[PDB]
Amino acid sequence: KTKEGVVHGVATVAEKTKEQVTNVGGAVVTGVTAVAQKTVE
Amino acid sequence: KTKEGVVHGVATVAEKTKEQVTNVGGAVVTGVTAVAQKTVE
Amino acid sequence: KTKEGVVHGVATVAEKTKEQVTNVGGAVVTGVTAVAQKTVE
Amino acid sequence: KTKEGVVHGVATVAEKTKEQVTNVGGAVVTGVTAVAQKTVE
Amino acid sequence: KTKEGVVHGVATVAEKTKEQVTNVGGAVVTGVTAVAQKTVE
Amino acid sequence: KTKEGVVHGVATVAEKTKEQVTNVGGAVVTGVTAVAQKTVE
Amino acid sequence: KTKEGVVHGVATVAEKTKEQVTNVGGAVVTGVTAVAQKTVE
Amino acid sequence: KTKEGVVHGVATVAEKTKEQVTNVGGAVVTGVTAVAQKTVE
Amino acid sequence: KTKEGVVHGVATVAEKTKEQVTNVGGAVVTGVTAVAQKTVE
Amino acid sequence: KTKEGVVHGVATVAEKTKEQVTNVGGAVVTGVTAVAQKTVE
Numbered sequence: 001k002t003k004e005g006v007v008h009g010v011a012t013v014a015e016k017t018k019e020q021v022t023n024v025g026g027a028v029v030t031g032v033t034a035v036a037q038k039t040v041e
Numbered sequence: 042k043t044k045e046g047v048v049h050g051v052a053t054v055a056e057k058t059k060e061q062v063t064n065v066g067g068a069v070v071t072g073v074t075a076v077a078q079k080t081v082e
Numbered sequence: 083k084t085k086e087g088v089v090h091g092v093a094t095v096a097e098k099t100k101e102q103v104t105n106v107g108g109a110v111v112t113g114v115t116a117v118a119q120k121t122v123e
Numbered sequence: 124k125t126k127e128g129v130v131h132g133v134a135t136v137a138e139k140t141k142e143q144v145t146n147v148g149g150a151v152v153t154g155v156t157a158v159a160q161k162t163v164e
Numbered sequence: 165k166t167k168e169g170v171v172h173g174v175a176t177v178a179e180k181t182k183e184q185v186t187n188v189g190g191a192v193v194t195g196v197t198a199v200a201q202k203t204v205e
Numbered sequence: 206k207t208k209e210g211v212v213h214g215v216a217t218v219a220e221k222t223k224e225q226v227t228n229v230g231g232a233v234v235t236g237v238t239a240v241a242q243k244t245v246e
Numbered sequence: 247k248t249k250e251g252v253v254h255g256v257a258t259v260a261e262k263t264k265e266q267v268t269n270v271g272g273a274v275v276t277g278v279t280a281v282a283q284k285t286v287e
Numbered sequence: 288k289t290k291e292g293v294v295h296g297v298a299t300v301a302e303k304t305k306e307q308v309t310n311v312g313g314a315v316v317t318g319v320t321a322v323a324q325k326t327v328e
Numbered sequence: 329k330t331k332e333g334v335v336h337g338v339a340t341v342a343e344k345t346k347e348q349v350t351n352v353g354g355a356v357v358t359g360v361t362a363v364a365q366k367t368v369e
Numbered sequence: 370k371t372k373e374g375v376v377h378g379v380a381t382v383a384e385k386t387k388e389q390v391t392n393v394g395g396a397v398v399t400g401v402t403a404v405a406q407k408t409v410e
Binding site: 091092094105108110113115117 | 129135137
């Protein structure tokens with residue numbers, strides 16, 4: 001009757017975001033949402 | 042009657058986003074949503 | 083009847099964000115939201 | 124009938140943020156929201 | 165009927181923030197919100 | 206009879222390099238050699 | 247009969263380098279060599 | 288008959304380097320060699 | 329017949345370096361060698 | 370027949386260095402070698 005891992009609210013808010021990105025090498029990532037929910041029993 | 046791994050709310054909000062990206066090498070990724078839910082029993 | 087790990091509210095707010103990024107090497111990331119919820123029982 | 128780890132309110136507020144970033148090496152990150160909720164029972 | 169770890173209010177407020185960042189080496193991070201809630205039972 | 210921009214020696218040496226890389230999102234780059242020689246007259 | 251910008255020796259030496267890299271989001275880069283030789287006349 | 292910018296010796300030596308890197312967000316870079324030789328006349 | 333900027337010897341030596349790095353947010357960089365030789369005439 | 374800026378010897382020696390680094394936010398850098406030789410004439 002238990003619950004081990006719960007995630008229910010996380011916010012990430014931007015507004016009117018203009019930008020320029022210029023690297024030499026490496027990898028450009030704009031948005032990120034990722035889950036690696038390694039639950040071992 | 043248990044629950045081990047639950048994810049129910051994660052937000053990622055942008056608005057009016059203009060940009061320019063120019064790398065030399067590497068890989069451009071704009072949006073990201075990814076799940077690697079390695080659940081071993 | 084227990085709950086071990088709960089996350090329910092986290093805010094990250096910006097507004098009217100103009101920028102320029104120029105590295106030589108390395109990797110540019112603009113937004114970040116990530117969960118690695120390693121729950122082992 | 125217990126609760127071990129709860130996070131419910133964390134604020135991060137900016138406004139009208141203009142900037143320029145120029146490194147030589149290293150990796151530029153603009154926004155950060157991240158959870159590593161290692162709950163072991 | 166107990167609660168071990170609770171976080172409910174933390175503020176981080178800026179306003180009208182213009183800046184310039186120029187390192188040689190190292191990694192620029194603008195916003196930070198992060199949780200590493202290592203709760204072991 | 207002049208020379209404006211000359212690059213003649215830069216070394217990058219590794220040896221016996223074993224590794225493992227596992228991201229969730231983003232782009233893996235192993236070797237990097239890159240030139241963006243923006244010479245404007 | 248002049249020379250404006252010359253680079254002739256820079257070393258970067260490692261040996262017997264074993265490692266493991268595991269991010270959640272962001273981009274892994276192992277080696278870096280990069281030139282952005284913006285010479286304007 | 289002049290020389291404005293010369294770089295001829297810079298060392299970076301490691302040996303027998305074992306490591307592990309685990310971030311949540313952000314970008315891992317192992318080796319770095321980079322030149323941004325902005326020479327304006 | 330002059331020389332304005334010369335760099336000829338800089339050492340950075342380590343030996344038998346084992347480590348572990350674990351951040352939550354931010355970017356891990358292991359080695360650093362970088363030149364930003366802004367020579368304006 | 371002059372020389373304005375010369376750097377010829379700088380040492381940085383470690384030995385048998387084992388460590389562990391664990392931040393929450395911010396960016397880990399292990400080795401550092403960097404030159405920003407802003408020579409203006």
